[PDB]
Amino acid sequence: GSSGSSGDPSWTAQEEMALLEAVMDCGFGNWQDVANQMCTKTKEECEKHYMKYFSGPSSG
Known part of the structure; x- marks a missing residue:
């Protein structure tokens, strides 16, 4: 029950959505x-x- 409300000093909102879509x-x-x-970063x-956010216990 979450859309994806959480920014980051490294990643961007676009990257997040792009990650899922892909x-x-x-x-x-x-x-x-x-x-x-996601080219914006390394496949790694x-x-x-x-797995950090998506596959994570708490937003983070």
Whole structure:
């Protein structure tokens, strides 16, 4: 029950949405394909970050 209200001094609002879209457009594990719209960062960061907030206990 959350849209995605949480900024970051590193990532941006666009990156967040882009991360999901790619994750749903391509699929999980395809850090490579996802890097397409996430190019803004390293496929490695797109993963850790994802599991950070999305796959996290509390907003963060």
